[PDB]
Structures are given as structure tokens and as C-alpha cells.
Amino acid sequence: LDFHGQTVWVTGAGKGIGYATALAFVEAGANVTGFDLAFDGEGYPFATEMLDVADADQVRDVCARLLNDIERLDVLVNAAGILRMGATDQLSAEDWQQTFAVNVGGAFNLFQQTMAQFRRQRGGAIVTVASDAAHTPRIGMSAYGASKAALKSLALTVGLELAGSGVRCNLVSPGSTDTDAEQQRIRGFGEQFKLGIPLGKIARPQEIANTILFLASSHASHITLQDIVVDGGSTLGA
Ligand SMILES: NC(=O)c1ccc[n+]([C@@H]2O[C@H](COP(=O)([O-])OP(=O)(O)OC[C@H]3O[C@@H](n4cnc5c(N)ncnc54)[C@H](O)[C@@H]3O)[C@@H](O)[C@H]2O)c1
Numbered sequence: 477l478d479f480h481g482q483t484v485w486v487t488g489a490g491k492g493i494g495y496a497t498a499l500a501f502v503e504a505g506a507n508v509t510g511f512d513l514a515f516d517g518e519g520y521p522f523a524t525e526m527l528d529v530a531d532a533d534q535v536r537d538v539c540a541r542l543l544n545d546i547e548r549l550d551v552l553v554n555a556a557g558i559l560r561m562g563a564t565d566q567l568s569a570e571d572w573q574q575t576f577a578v579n580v581g582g583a584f585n586l587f588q589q590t591m592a593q594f595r596r597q598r599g600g601a602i603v604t605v606a607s608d609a610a611h612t613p614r615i616g617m618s619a620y621g622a623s624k625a626a627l628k629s630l631a632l633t634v635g636l637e638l639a640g641s642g643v644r645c646n647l648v649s650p651g652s653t654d655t656d657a658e659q660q661r662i663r664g665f666g667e668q669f670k671l672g673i674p675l676g677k678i679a680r681p682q683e684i685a686n687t688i689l690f691l692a693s694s695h696a697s698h699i700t701l702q703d704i705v706v707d708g709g710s711t712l713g714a
Contacts, residue, residue, distance in 0.1 A: 477504050477689050477690065477693050477695070478504060478505055478693075479501055479504040479505050479506035479550075479551075479689075479692075479693070480504075480505035480506070481505070481506075481507065482505075482506045482507065482550035482551060483506070483507050483509075483546050483547075483548060483549050483550050483551070484498075484501045484506045484507065484508045484509070484550060484551040484552075484553070484692075485508075485509050485511065485549060485551070485552045485553065486498040486501065486508060486509070486510050486511070486522075486553040486555060487510075487511045487512065487527070487529055487553065487554055487555055487556040487582065487586065488511075488512055488554075488555035488556035488557060488605075489508075489510025489511060489512050489515075489520075489522070489524070489555070490510070490512035490513065490514055490515050490516065490517075491655070492653075492655035492681060493555055493605060493650065493653060493655065493681045493684045493685065494510065494512065494553075494555035494556065494605075495510070495681070496681035496682050496684065496685040497553055497555060497681075497684070497685040497688050497689075498510045498520075498522050498553075499521060499522075499685070500682065500685040500686065500688075500689055501522075501551070501689065502521050502522050504689060506550075506551075508522035508523065509522060509523045509524070509525060509542070510522050510523070510524050510525070511524075511525045511526075511527040511529065511538070511556070512524070512525075512526070512527065512556070513526075513527070513528055513556075514526075525538055525542070529556045529578065529581070529582030529583075529585060529586060530574070530577040530578045530581045530582055530585070531585075532581070532585045532588075535585040535586060535588075535589055536585075536588075536589055539586070539589035539590060540589070543589075543590075543593055547597075548597045548600070549590065549593050549594070549597070549600060550600050550601065550692075551600065551601050551602070551603070551692045552586065552590055552600075552601075552602050552603075553602075553603045553604075553605070553688055553692070554582065554583040554586060554602070554603070554604040554605065554627075554631070555604075555605040556578065556582050557578060557579050557582075557605065557607075557624075558574065558575065558578050558579065559617075559620050560572075560574065560575050560619060560620065561616045561617055561620065562616065562619075563616065563618075564618045564619070567618075567619055571619065572619055575619045575620060575623045576619075576623050576626070579620070579623035579624060579626075579627055580623055580626045580627050580630060583604055583627055583630060583631060584630060587630070587634050591634065591637070591638060594638050594641060594643045595638065595641045597641075598641050598642050599641065599642040599643060600642075600643050600644075601643070601644045601645075601646075601691070601692040601693075601696075602631065602634070602635065602638075602643065602644070602645040602646070603645075603646055603647065603648065603688045603691050603692050604627060604628070604631040604645075604646075604647045604648075605647070605648050605649075605650065605684070605688070606624045606625075606627055606628045606631075606647050606648070606649040606703065607620070607621070607624040607649055607650060608649050608650065608651040608705060608707050608710065608711055609621035609624055610624040610625040610627070610628050610649060611649060611705060611711050611714050612711050612714055614670065615668045615669075615670070624649075628647055628649075628703060631645055631647055632645065632647075632701050632703075635700055635701050636701065639700060643700075644691075644696065644697075644699060644700040645700055645701065646691045646696070646699060646700060646701065646702045646703065646704070647702070647703040647704070648684060648687050648688055648691065648703070648704050648706055649703055649704065649705045649706065649707070650679055650684045650706050650707065651673065651678070651679060651705070651706065651707025651708060651710045651711070652673070652678040652679060652707070652710075653678065653679040653680070653681055653684060654678060654679070654680055654681065655681060658678055661673065661678060662676055662677065662678065664710075671710050671711070671712065672710065673707065673708040673709065673710045674708055674709035674710070675708030675709055676708070677708060678708070679706060679707065679708065683706060684706055687704050687706050691704065
């Protein structure tokens, strides 16, 4: 897949799926910018911008600065996110608040600062990383799952608001990804009503990034408001 000369922004580019996706876009020929709280590696094969996606003021300021000098923003990938686990009645006030500020507020702030640009240029692609936990309830992850369901609903409504402008807006919802507990995930936990993984393996970040590239590409030129679950079948299609 080819992205030569296209401007691509990826949040959460510091590691995990965000890094793998920013890298895949580089290897597809794009001009990439990764945004993240921290870039603790010694080097990155793309340009980097310190950014707390939950700080609405910092997002405004960075997006304004960068949009001053780019003609066109071909692809925005929302991949920043955190996981805070706990039973619903034991989750701390702080874990609830930052779960939502980061996992939903982050994309909301990016949308508030970039939608005008997508409207102006009359096209582009957005891809937002949700989670399998937005598709199915997960013991221990009520807050995380709900924050990713909010994210999914947000990105689909944004996609409907920008469809008039020719923008495609989609999601990828990863299951367990590598970022003997692995063989027990694959088998499943019947006791917590969490199915194993029929494909008999967990995901590699590249397999999430590859799906994001497809959805951001012109091969997906008629695909909008879709959410591809990448999880070896663990949710059984739900
Ligand atoms: N790993 C899995 O199995 C899995 C499953 C479902 C969903 N996901 C989702 O995939 C995406 C990437 O997750 P990962 O597994 O690569 O996680 P990770 O923790 O390895 O990396 C996520 C990155 O997000 C960045 N980030 C966190 N808070 C931020 C903030 N406020 N502002 C800017 N950047 C911030 C972190 O600094 C980190 O670099 C996330 O959206 C995550 O929720 C992952």
C-alpha cells in the first residue's frame, strides 16, 4: 500500500500500536508526524510532537501551529489511549477521570481542531483505534470499555458530520495485542465469560497497523463509518 507524499498524523505514536502505525505509514512512503505524551526512544523514523491529547489548550496550540504550514492533512489516526482496570465499585476517582479525558477527550480535542481543515480541503481519511472491549462487556474493564464505546460513537458521528466533505471515518477495534499468560488468553476464561481466540494466537501491532493502512487508503474509497474488529475472532463477529 502506497501513501507517497501524504501528510499523516498519528497520536500515541510513542510505542505500541501507535508506533507501529506511524512506522507502517513511513514504510508506505508518507510524511508522518507522531504525537505523544513522551517519546522516550533515542530516535524515531518520523517527526515527533510532544502533546497531551487530553489538554485541550495544548492540542489547539499545536494543531494551529502545524496547520499553518500544511496544505492538506491526508490522514489522522487517533491511537492514544490508556488502560486503567478495576471492578466498577473499586475504581478510583482518578482512574475514572483520566480514562475518559484521554480515551474520549483526546479524540474530541483533535476533532475540534482538525474538522475545519478536513472541511476546507474536501477529503481525507480518519481512523480511530477503539477496542474489543467496546463490543462486549469485560470483567475488570467497565470504565475502559465504556470510554472506548464513547470514542467509537464519537468518531462515527464525526464521520457523518464530515461525509458531506468527502472524508471517510472508520475504526479498528483490536483484541489482545503484544505490547504463560498469553496461552491462557488464547484458551479463554469461561469463568469470566471471556471467549478464547479461535485463530489460536494474539495480535501483533503490525496486524493492527496494516488494517489502519487499508482503511486510510484509496482501496477503501467507499468504506466509511465501519469498525473492523482485529481479534482472531474472539468476539465471534460482535
Ligand atoms: N494492547 C491491546 O491489546 C489493546 C487492546 C484494545 C485496544 N488497544 C488500543 O490501542 C491503542 C494503542 O495502545 P497500545 O497497546 O499501543 O498502548 P501503549 O500503552 O503501549 O501505547 C499507547 C501510547 O499512548 C500514549 N498516550 C497515553 N496517554 C496520552 C495522552 N494523554 N496524550 C498523548 N498520548 C498519550 C502513551 O504515551 C503511549 O505511547 C490505544 O488506543 C489502546 O487503548 C490496545
